[PDB]
Enzyme design. Structure first.
Site, PDB file in Angstrom:
ATOM      1  N   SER A 142     -43.714  77.836 -25.290  1.00 50.62           N
ATOM      2  CA  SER A 142     -43.685  78.973 -24.365  1.00 50.62           C
ATOM      3  C   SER A 142     -43.034  78.407 -23.102  1.00 50.62           C
ATOM      4  O   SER A 142     -43.111  77.200 -22.869  1.00 50.62           O
ATOM      5  CB  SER A 142     -45.101  79.486 -24.052  1.00 50.62           C
ATOM      6  OG  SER A 142     -45.724  78.713 -23.037  1.00 50.62           O
ATOM      7  N   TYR A 143     -42.384  79.238 -22.291  1.00 50.06           N
ATOM      8  CA  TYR A 143     -42.241  80.676 -22.515  1.00 50.06           C
ATOM      9  C   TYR A 143     -40.750  81.012 -22.467  1.00 50.06           C
ATOM     10  O   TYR A 143     -39.928  80.128 -22.250  1.00 50.06           O
ATOM     11  CB  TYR A 143     -42.953  81.442 -21.396  1.00 50.06           C
ATOM     12  CG  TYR A 143     -42.352  81.174 -20.027  1.00 50.06           C
ATOM     13  CD1 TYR A 143     -42.688  80.028 -19.303  1.00 50.06           C
ATOM     14  CD2 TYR A 143     -41.395  82.035 -19.486  1.00 50.06           C
ATOM     15  CE1 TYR A 143     -42.082  79.744 -18.068  1.00 50.06           C
ATOM     16  CE2 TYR A 143     -40.779  81.756 -18.257  1.00 50.06           C
ATOM     17  CZ  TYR A 143     -41.128  80.612 -17.554  1.00 50.06           C
ATOM     18  OH  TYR A 143     -40.528  80.348 -16.337  1.00 50.06           O
TER      19      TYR A 143
ATOM     20  N   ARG B  28     -46.775  68.440 -18.657  1.00 52.02           N
ATOM     21  CA  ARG B  28     -46.204  68.736 -19.970  1.00 52.02           C
ATOM     22  C   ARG B  28     -46.025  67.539 -20.902  1.00 52.02           C
ATOM     23  O   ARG B  28     -46.005  67.699 -22.120  1.00 52.02           O
ATOM     24  CB  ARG B  28     -44.851  69.435 -19.805  1.00 52.02           C
ATOM     25  CG  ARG B  28     -43.721  68.508 -19.368  1.00 52.02           C
ATOM     26  CD  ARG B  28     -42.588  69.286 -18.708  1.00 52.02           C
ATOM     27  NE  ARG B  28     -41.970  70.256 -19.607  1.00 52.02           N
ATOM     28  CZ  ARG B  28     -41.045  69.955 -20.514  1.00 52.02           C
ATOM     29  NH1 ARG B  28     -40.625  68.706 -20.647  1.00 52.02           N
ATOM     30  NH2 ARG B  28     -40.540  70.907 -21.286  1.00 52.02           N
TER      31      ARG B  28
ATOM     32  N   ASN C 170     -41.007  66.309 -27.009  1.00 49.29           N
ATOM     33  CA  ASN C 170     -39.994  67.052 -27.763  1.00 49.29           C
ATOM     34  C   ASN C 170     -38.565  66.577 -27.495  1.00 49.29           C
ATOM     35  O   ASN C 170     -37.597  67.310 -27.707  1.00 49.29           O
ATOM     36  CB  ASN C 170     -40.100  68.561 -27.518  1.00 49.29           C
ATOM     37  CG  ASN C 170     -39.424  69.369 -28.622  1.00 49.29           C
ATOM     38  OD1 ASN C 170     -39.500  69.009 -29.800  1.00 49.29           O
ATOM     39  ND2 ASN C 170     -38.769  70.460 -28.250  1.00 49.29           N
ATOM     40  N   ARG C 171     -38.450  65.335 -27.037  1.00 54.98           N
ATOM     41  CA  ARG C 171     -37.164  64.701 -26.767  1.00 54.98           C
ATOM     42  C   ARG C 171     -37.241  63.256 -27.273  1.00 54.98           C
ATOM     43  O   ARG C 171     -36.307  62.470 -27.106  1.00 54.98           O
ATOM     44  CB  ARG C 171     -36.856  64.726 -25.263  1.00 54.98           C
ATOM     45  CG  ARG C 171     -36.406  66.094 -24.753  1.00 54.98           C
ATOM     46  CD  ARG C 171     -35.954  66.035 -23.301  1.00 54.98           C
ATOM     47  NE  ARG C 171     -35.181  67.216 -22.914  1.00 54.98           N
ATOM     48  CZ  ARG C 171     -35.670  68.454 -22.851  1.00 54.98           C
ATOM     49  NH1 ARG C 171     -36.943  68.694 -23.146  1.00 54.98           N
ATOM     50  NH2 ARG C 171     -34.879  69.456 -22.498  1.00 54.98           N
TER      51      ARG C 171
ATOM     52  N   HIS D 116     -46.168  70.477 -25.798  1.00 57.35           N
ATOM     53  CA  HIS D 116     -46.017  70.493 -24.342  1.00 57.35           C
ATOM     54  C   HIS D 116     -47.354  71.065 -23.870  1.00 57.35           C
ATOM     55  O   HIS D 116     -47.588  72.274 -23.951  1.00 57.35           O
ATOM     56  CB  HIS D 116     -44.854  71.400 -23.933  1.00 57.35           C
ATOM     57  CG  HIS D 116     -43.509  70.756 -24.088  1.00 57.35           C
ATOM     58  ND1 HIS D 116     -42.344  71.480 -24.213  1.00 57.35           N
ATOM     59  CD2 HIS D 116     -43.143  69.452 -24.120  1.00 57.35           C
ATOM     60  CE1 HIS D 116     -41.318  70.654 -24.317  1.00 57.35           C
ATOM     61  NE2 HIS D 116     -41.776  69.417 -24.263  1.00 57.35           N
ATOM     62  N   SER D 117     -48.223  70.181 -23.389  1.00 60.67           N
ATOM     63  CA  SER D 117     -49.579  70.532 -22.975  1.00 60.67           C
ATOM     64  C   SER D 117     -49.849  71.733 -22.071  1.00 60.67           C
ATOM     65  O   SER D 117     -50.858  72.415 -22.253  1.00 60.67           O
ATOM     66  CB  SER D 117     -50.268  69.293 -22.390  1.00 60.67           C
ATOM     67  OG  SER D 117     -49.474  68.676 -21.396  1.00 60.67           O
TER      68      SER D 117
ATOM     69  N   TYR E 242     -29.490  75.541 -23.841  1.00 64.57           N
ATOM     70  CA  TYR E 242     -28.552  74.512 -23.393  1.00 64.57           C
ATOM     71  C   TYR E 242     -28.733  73.287 -24.276  1.00 64.57           C
ATOM     72  O   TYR E 242     -29.603  73.274 -25.148  1.00 64.57           O
ATOM     73  CB  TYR E 242     -28.768  74.146 -21.909  1.00 64.57           C
ATOM     74  CG  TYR E 242     -30.209  73.940 -21.484  1.00 64.57           C
ATOM     75  CD1 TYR E 242     -31.006  72.954 -22.072  1.00 64.57           C
ATOM     76  CD2 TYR E 242     -30.778  74.736 -20.483  1.00 64.57           C
ATOM     77  CE1 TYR E 242     -32.336  72.768 -21.677  1.00 64.57           C
ATOM     78  CE2 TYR E 242     -32.108  74.558 -20.079  1.00 64.57           C
ATOM     79  CZ  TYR E 242     -32.879  73.574 -20.682  1.00 64.57           C
ATOM     80  OH  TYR E 242     -34.197  73.409 -20.305  1.00 64.57           O
TER      81      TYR E 242
HETATM   82  O1  INF Z   1     -39.243  75.399 -21.168  1.00 64.55           O
HETATM   83  C1  INF Z   1     -39.369  74.969 -22.308  1.00 64.55           C
HETATM   84  N1  INF Z   1     -40.469  75.180 -23.044  1.00 64.55           N
HETATM   85  O2  INF Z   1     -40.553  74.668 -24.351  1.00 64.55           O
HETATM   86  N2  INF Z   1     -38.436  74.247 -22.958  1.00 64.55           N
HETATM   87  C2  INF Z   1     -37.133  73.878 -22.388  1.00 64.55           C
HETATM   88  C3  INF Z   1     -35.959  74.414 -23.273  1.00 64.55           C
HETATM   89  C4  INF Z   1     -35.985  74.044 -24.753  1.00 64.55           C
HETATM   90  C5  INF Z   1     -36.740  74.795 -25.696  1.00 64.55           C
HETATM   91  C6  INF Z   1     -36.753  74.431 -27.068  1.00 64.55           C
HETATM   92  C7  INF Z   1     -36.011  73.309 -27.515  1.00 64.55           C
HETATM   93  C8  INF Z   1     -35.252  72.553 -26.587  1.00 64.55           C
HETATM   94  C9  INF Z   1     -35.241  72.918 -25.220  1.00 64.55           C
HETATM   95  C10 INF Z   1     -37.063  72.336 -22.265  1.00 64.55           C
HETATM   96  O3  INF Z   1     -36.246  71.759 -21.621  1.00 64.55           O
HETATM   97  O4  INF Z   1     -38.013  71.700 -22.972  1.00 64.55           O
HETATM   98 ZN    ZN Z   2     -42.396  73.590 -24.761  1.00 70.79          ZN
END
Ligand code: INF
Ligand code: ZN
Length: 307
Positions: A197-198, A127, A144-145, A69-70, A248
């Site tokens: 972070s964070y 991001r 990351n999804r 996430h940049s 969540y």
């Molecule tokens: O606000 C952040 N920063 O990573 N992450 C949030 C929560 C998160 C963290 C780790 C794994 C899954 C979800 C997001 O929606 O991506």
């Molecule tokens: Zn992140």
């Protein structure tokens, strides 16, 4: 900077400065570090991974990625510090020395280079990646999804314009597929860590399902020990638990994928702070953050070595 010794670890850097830093480190410790290119970003930028090894052939390995996430600048800053730290502590610190004598470490400081450049050039809070969607004016995917773990399920958005857009299909983003292929081809990774972070949290699987992992008891105690070690330096307080019960539901996550691949020690770190500065953490907190995070990471590495 003409030497990794003159590099300023207490300030934020650009993509070019970080990339130049990599070559200096490799030139200074050729017997310990090597730079590998595992692919190219959507906009053609090379994707580099630093490999720390003292020899052997396909030794058990530890994976660490930062900056997926940049806008989370504290992670790339921490990654540079980490790389330097490895070269200085080998042969000085008994614990880390024993780890590197038996295992290899793969470090990806800038997992999302196209997004990183954009945060420096146009939008500091961007991001996602920078891929273009067929039928939409919106750019990027939440890397990351985009992983093949409960992909497309609740905890991600199907809208291209969303900050949490999961993409057209699992592994559609080249920045993600490049890691997938590398890890699968290697086949001997024992730990997988993603730095973000964070919020100051240490998380383990899962995020896409309420189902508990078979190794919950062990990872929970490993996580507890790691946060205790991390807090001992400056008193920074971390919370820990599975992703879905601590934050969540979230689908397509990297550690959910890595764990399903058999990589038991899969953890996600969410560094400083708890909102005061958020993504815009002051440069003066870079080193303290890196120093404490190191203790927590080392704790997990030690456990990985003996089990
Ligand atoms: O606000 C952040 N920063 O990573 N992450 C949030 C929560 C998160 C963290 C780790 C794994 C899954 C979800 C997001 O929606 O991506
Ligand atoms: Zn992140």
């Amino acid at each position: 900077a003409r030497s990794t010794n003159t590099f300023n670890y207490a300030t934020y850097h650009t993509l070019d400065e970080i990339y130049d830093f990599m070559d200096l480190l490799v030139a200074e410790h050729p017997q310990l570090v090597s730079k590998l290119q595992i692919g190219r970003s959507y906009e053609g930028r090379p994707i580099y991974v630093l490999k720390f090894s003292t020899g052997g052939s396909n030794r058990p390995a530890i994976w660490i990625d930062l900056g997926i996430h940049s806008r989370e600048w504290i992670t790339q800053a921490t990654g540079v510090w980490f790389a330097k730290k490895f070269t200085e502590d080998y042969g000085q610190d008994p614990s880390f020395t024993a780890i590197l004598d038996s295992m290899d470490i793969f470090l990806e400081i800038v997992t999302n280079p196209d997004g990183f450049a954009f945060t420096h050039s146009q939008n500091r809070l961007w991001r996602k990646t920078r891929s273009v969607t067929s039928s939409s004016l919106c750019v990027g995917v939440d890397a990351n999804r985009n992983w093949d773990a409960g992909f497309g399920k609740a905890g991600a958005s199907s809208s291209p314009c969303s900050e949490t857009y999961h993409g057209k299909y699992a592994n559609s983003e080249v920045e993600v597929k490049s890691i997938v292929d590398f890890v699968k081809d290697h086949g001997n990774f024992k730990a997988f860590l993603s730095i973000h972070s964070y919020s100051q949290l240490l998380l383990y699987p899962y995020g896409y399902t309420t189902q508990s992992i078979p190794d919950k008891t062990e990872l929970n105690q490993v996580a507890k020990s790691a946060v205790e070690a991390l807090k001992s330096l400056y008193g920074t307080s971390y919370k820990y638990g599975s992703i879905i019960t601590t934050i969540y539901q979230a689908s397509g996550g990297s550690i959910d994928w890595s764990y399903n691949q058999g990589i038991k020690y899969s953890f996600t770190f969410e560094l400083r702070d708890t909102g005061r500065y958020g993504f815009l953490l002051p440069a003066s907190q870079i080193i303290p953050t890196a120093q404490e995070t190191w203790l927590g990471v080392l704790t997990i590495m030690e456990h990985t070595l003996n089990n």
